[PDB]
Symmetry: C4
Subunit: 93 residues, 4 copies
C-alpha cells in the first residue's frame, strides 16, 4: 500500500503536467487536457483531441515514453493490491 501511494502520487503528478502542458500550448480547456492526457498514457488514444502544434507533437512523443511506464505500473498495483483483495473478500463464505 505504500508502494500504491507512491505510484498514485507519481501518476497524479504526471497527469498534472500533461494537463498544464496541453491547456497552455494546445489551448485545451483544463478538463479536456486532463482527459486527453489520460486517454494518451493509457494508450486508448481516441484522437478526439490530438496535438496540432509541433511543440505539442514533440512533447507528446516524450510524454508517452516517460508516462506509459508509471501509468501502467500504477494500474497494475491498483488491480493487484487493491481490486484483487476486495474482490476476494466479497466472495468469502
Amino acid at each position: 500500500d505504500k508502494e500504491f501511494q507512491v505510484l498514485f502520487v507519481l501518476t497524479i503528478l504526471t497527469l498534472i503536467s500533461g494537463t498544464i502542458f496541453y491547456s497552455t500550448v494546445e489551448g485545451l480547456r483544463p478538463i479536456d487536457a486532463l482527459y486527453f492526457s489520460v486517454v494518451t498514457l493509457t494508450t486508448v488514444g481516441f484522437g478526439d483531441f490530438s496535438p496540432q502544434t509541433d511543440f505539442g507533437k514533440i512533447f507528446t512523443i516524450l510524454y508517452i515514453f516517460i508516462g506509459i511506464g508509471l501509468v501502467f505500473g500504477f494500474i497494475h498495483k491498483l488491480a493487484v493490491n487493491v481490486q484483487l483483495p476486495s474482490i476476494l473478500s466479497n466472495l468469502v463464505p
Copy 2:
C-alpha cells in the same frame, strides 16, 4: 476455471455499467454504448464514439483506470486457461 468465471462475471458487470452510463449520459444506443465500452477498456480506442460531455469525460478517465485491469485480467486467463488448452488438444497425435 473458477477464476475464469469470476473474471468473466466481473467483466460482464463492468461492461454493463459502461453500457448504462454511455447510453444515458452520452445518449448512445445501448449497442453503441457496449461497443464503445469494449473499444475503450481493451485500449483499442477507435474514437468513432467518444464522450462529448464533461460528465462523460470524467467517467471515462475513472472507467479506464478501474476497468483496464480486470478486462486484461479476463483476457489473459481466457488466453491461458481456455484458448491455450484447446489449441494444444487440437495438435495431439
Copy 3:
C-alpha cells in the same frame, strides 16, 4: 520455434477471418479489411476504418476478446524467440 510456428499460423488464421468478415459485412476492400484487423487486434485502433453496422460492432467486440491474446502471444515470441537472438548475434565480438 515450433511454438513460434503455431502462433504464426494461428495469427494468420485470425487475420484471414477478420479480412473475410470486414470485406463482406462492412464492405471493405480485402487489403483495408486486413489492415483494419491488424490495427484492431494490436490495439492501435486508428479508427480510419471502424465498423458501421451492428453486425460489425458485435463481431468486433468478440474478435477483440478472442484475438488480442494470440496476437500478443505471437508478438511476444517473435520478440523473444526471433528478434532477441538475432540482435544478440549481431553484437558478438
Copy 4:
C-alpha cells in the same frame, strides 16, 4: 544499462525507419512522420495521421508486428532500470 543502451539504439533506428518511410510514401513532414511512428508503435493510435496508400497500409502492418516488441521492451527497461531507481533515490531518508 548496457541493455538499456541497446534498446535505446534499436528504438531510435526503428523510429528513423518509420520517419523516412512515412515522409516519403505517405508524404508527411518528417516531424509528423516521427510523431506518427511513435503514436503507432506505442499503440496509442490517435489516427490524426494514418496511411492512405496501400503501400503505407502494408508497411504499417509489418512495422507494428516488428516494432511493438522492441518499443515496449525499451519502455519496460526505461521504467525498471532508469525511472525506478531515480524515484527510490528521491525517497531516501
